[PDB]
């Protein structure tokens, strides 16, 4: 950032005012800027139409909108408020795309089961009326003082209702509604959030939404500057029209405040009156705060006093760190780096973290499955392998992405897109690890043919000099007819695949997984072959699984199949048990 202020001072050709100073401290900070990932990201194969969340076409009529955000720092400080707020925000990003939130998917990484994080998530999720269809729980002391909370949200939006995260023409107005702005971020509540969801969609139907963006880091500042910058336009932000929680706030406060449950809507001036009516009706606070213009300047006004004015683009774009070319080495073999294997059934139940109460199949089997209609549905998988990543960064990440495809295929789904969250340590002290990650993901996608639809990033995850295990959490989207999805029943258990790994024959395993899934077999793809959750959920059906699991370690290419007949495929197949009663 030091580098960054003399750059700012260079561009501004003067010392920044107190406000500018504040305004850039946020827009240019890693979180909002992505100065270390912009380049590495642009490299990744994209798809759909990403705004505040990637939107993937699911059947030419409907599209699923999803994204996976992190809440690592705010969760480290406060677990409950940390988690719940992460849930609040990511859901808004999905909301801002015109899709109705339909699932919340977990990805916790901790030194122990922090009840604060699990409840903050469950509570908020329940209070907005959005199920937590699935999740992923990784336990390790390596995450002792740096809990990783990766929350993924998803929703459905008709393709003829997709909402853009940008301003299109000089003359539109930007509306800010939802919670009232107050000195937050120099405590969110789902009731409001719920009204925001029910209120936003409402407006969307009436064609009253021509552009939108959630309010997160940066408050009124980020949402307006980015709404106009994305469309090479400008804005005349009138801070006195922002509804305030605490009325005695200074311009710079209102502007940069980070109050929760707030949205920004870009629309036609003639539509605002209605936006504010649907907004007030749902007990929210709205008003026409900003106005999009042609001169690419970001002019912030209070009443008649000029608070600030800068080249909108200078704000939108942050200095870009260079990139480092990582050249994959030979694949090394990993050793049992273990993640404690902790059982939190009755904990998830105590806090109502039901995880899968309305899916085609209990998310305890990995890939969640949601219906869109009788014969139309999508799949959600969240994977990650820091145990391998720790050891080797490139190959451990590449593998998490491959293992995700399996999970996706073990439910009968076609992989469509990937959303990922980058949980890394310090990029400056060790910029190679980061590149080893991004490259691993760049390659894995080019290998599987699955494109990145959206993503997130959390860097500088360190505890007094120590960086967290390189952790890229993979969020894959699958397509799938629910009717064809396989449900568990009494059958024999098989071990299909190799106890080891080989990048080439990954696709042969994908091939076998498909042949079998389609023949109606029920498959399981987890690095441990079988776990607590699996066993337990089989009981849900009144099934007792009895198998003699071979030994993989610690990155194999084998799944478990449960069918009547023996699997006839062009890959190792060995019978190993039952599943009855
Ligand atoms: N790791 C990533 N993979 C793919 N896209 C990413 C990644 N990190 C950031 N992005 C994209 O960069 C853009 C800005 O990200 P972000 O600031 O998180 O937007 P938002 O405030 O809506 O979360 C978005 O398109 C986001 O999806
Ligand atoms: Mg942003
Ligand atoms: Mg956003
Ligand atoms: Mg966001």
From Swiss-Prot:
Keywords: ATP-binding, Cytoplasm, Ligase, Magnesium, Metal-binding, Nucleotide-binding, Purine biosynthesis. Its EC number is 6.3.5.3. It is an enzyme of class 6 (ligase). Gene3D superfamilies: Formylglycinamide ribonucleotide amidotransferase, C-terminal domain (3.30.70.1670), PurM-like C-terminal domain (3.90.650.10), PurM-like, N-terminal domain (3.30.1330.10). The keyword ATP-binding applies. Purl possesses an auxiliary ATP Binding region which is not catalytic, but able to bind additional ATP. The conformational changes associated with its binding could have a regulatory role in formation of the PurLSQ complex. Part of the phosphoribosylformylglycinamidine synthase complex involved in the purines biosynthetic pathway. Catalyzes the ATP-dependent conversion of formylglycinamide ribonucleotide (FGAR) and glutamine to yield formylglycinamidine ribonucleotide (FGAM) and glutamate. The FGAM synthase complex is composed of three subunits. PurQ produces an ammonia molecule by converting glutamine to glutamate. PurL transfers the ammonia molecule to FGAR to form FGAM in an ATP-dependent manner. This is Phosphoribosylformylglycinamidine synthase subunit PurL. It comes from Thermotoga maritima (strain ATCC 43589 / DSM 3109 / JCM 10099 / NBRC 100826 / MSB8).
